[PDB]
DNA sequence: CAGTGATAGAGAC
DNA sequence: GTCTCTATCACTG
């Protein structure tokens, strides 16, 4: 809305992924995509980035409760 | 309105 | 038949 285009300089320094449902941050201030943030923070150890992909699978949606 | 942390499901071999 | 990774939800300021 405020921006005329979604484009931007934001790039995942861990997997170069320029597309993601949400941008995460690290106590270093370096930008990270949602996957690296979730995987890197949970794993804490390097893992073949060859897993990353330029396509994101859309999952279903369901309220946690109620 | 946006972002985070936590939990669970699905896919491929 | 089993394992792993990733996304989405709800809540708060
Ligand atoms: Zn990334």
Tab-separated table of C-alpha atoms (C1' of nucleotides) and ligand atoms in Angstrom:
chain	number	residue	atom	x	y	z
A	1	UNK	CA	0.000	0.000	0.000
A	2	UNK	CA	2.466	2.722	1.105
A	3	UNK	CA	5.106	1.394	-1.342
A	4	UNK	CA	4.362	1.551	-5.087
A	5	UNK	CA	6.094	-1.816	-5.714
A	6	UNK	CA	7.018	-4.758	-3.437
A	7	UNK	CA	10.541	-4.804	-4.948
A	8	UNK	CA	13.383	-3.575	-2.718
A	9	UNK	CA	17.097	-4.054	-1.856
A	10	UNK	CA	16.214	-6.564	0.868
A	11	UNK	CA	18.134	-9.793	0.130
A	12	UNK	CA	18.755	-12.871	2.314
A	13	UNK	CA	22.496	-12.764	3.080
A	14	UNK	CA	22.284	-16.491	3.945
A	15	UNK	CA	20.493	-17.844	0.820
A	16	UNK	CA	20.042	-14.777	-1.449
A	17	UNK	CA	16.293	-15.577	-1.430
A	18	UNK	CA	14.585	-12.317	-2.484
A	19	UNK	CA	11.063	-13.797	-2.060
A	20	UNK	CA	9.583	-14.735	1.346
A	21	UNK	CA	6.286	-14.468	3.322
A	22	UNK	CA	8.056	-12.415	6.025
A	23	UNK	CA	11.524	-10.940	6.702
A	24	UNK	CA	13.352	-11.982	9.897
A	25	UNK	CA	16.246	-10.230	11.700
A	26	UNK	CA	19.352	-11.441	13.598
A	27	UNK	CA	21.062	-9.879	16.694
A	28	UNK	CA	23.703	-8.799	14.117
A	29	UNK	CA	21.220	-6.692	12.108
A	30	UNK	CA	21.724	-8.753	8.922
A	31	UNK	CA	18.522	-9.468	6.877
A	32	UNK	CA	17.336	-13.106	6.656
A	33	UNK	CA	14.400	-14.747	4.841
A	34	UNK	CA	11.764	-16.651	6.843
A	35	UNK	CA	13.312	-20.089	6.155
A	36	UNK	CA	16.927	-19.211	7.152
A	37	UNK	CA	15.605	-17.450	10.262
A	38	UNK	CA	13.504	-20.465	11.291
A	39	UNK	CA	16.057	-23.105	10.220
A	40	UNK	CA	19.277	-21.306	11.218
A	41	UNK	CA	17.923	-20.215	14.629
A	42	UNK	CA	16.460	-23.673	15.374
A	43	UNK	CA	19.488	-25.581	14.000
A	44	UNK	CA	22.354	-23.225	14.969
A	45	UNK	CA	24.623	-25.054	12.453
A	46	UNK	CA	25.346	-24.636	8.724
A	47	UNK	CA	23.344	-26.943	6.432
A	48	UNK	CA	23.624	-27.335	2.594
A	49	UNK	CA	21.833	-24.181	1.399
A	50	UNK	CA	21.208	-26.316	-1.701
A	51	UNK	CA	17.897	-26.955	0.093
A	52	UNK	CA	16.703	-23.385	-0.566
A	53	UNK	CA	14.558	-22.954	-3.700
A	54	UNK	CA	13.153	-20.077	-5.782
A	55	UNK	CA	9.664	-21.613	-5.451
A	56	UNK	CA	7.662	-21.598	-2.177
A	57	UNK	CA	5.032	-24.274	-1.513
A	58	UNK	CA	1.755	-22.757	-0.276
A	59	UNK	CA	0.479	-24.723	2.752
A	60	UNK	CA	-3.109	-24.908	4.043
A	61	UNK	CA	-4.648	-22.647	6.708
A	62	UNK	CA	-6.451	-23.605	9.941
A	63	UNK	CA	-7.094	-21.761	13.225
A	64	UNK	CA	-4.997	-23.168	16.091
A	65	UNK	CA	-8.179	-23.302	18.207
A	66	UNK	CA	-11.779	-22.015	18.126
B	1	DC	C1'	-0.832	-3.075	10.602
B	2	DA	C1'	3.432	-5.689	11.338
B	3	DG	C1'	6.537	-9.106	13.489
B	4	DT	C1'	7.790	-13.062	16.574
B	5	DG	C1'	7.784	-17.857	18.621
B	6	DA	C1'	5.778	-22.300	18.655
B	7	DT	C1'	3.508	-26.368	16.841
B	8	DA	C1'	2.141	-29.580	13.349
B	9	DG	C1'	1.537	-31.597	8.551
B	10	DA	C1'	2.954	-32.969	4.137
B	11	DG	C1'	6.192	-34.589	0.374
B	12	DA	C1'	9.783	-37.575	-1.772
B	13	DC	C1'	12.529	-41.784	-1.825
C	1	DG	C1'	6.733	-46.878	5.677
C	2	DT	C1'	9.752	-43.258	7.717
C	3	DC	C1'	12.163	-38.854	8.225
C	4	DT	C1'	12.951	-33.753	7.758
C	5	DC	C1'	11.922	-28.868	6.521
C	6	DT	C1'	9.015	-25.079	5.969
C	7	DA	C1'	4.743	-22.277	6.598
C	8	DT	C1'	1.033	-20.722	8.878
C	9	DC	C1'	-1.621	-19.114	13.213
C	10	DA	C1'	-2.562	-16.193	17.352
C	11	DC	C1'	-1.250	-12.456	20.270
C	12	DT	C1'	0.672	-7.865	21.427
C	13	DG	C1'	2.059	-2.691	20.998
D	1	LIG	ZN1	17.382	-17.233	3.428
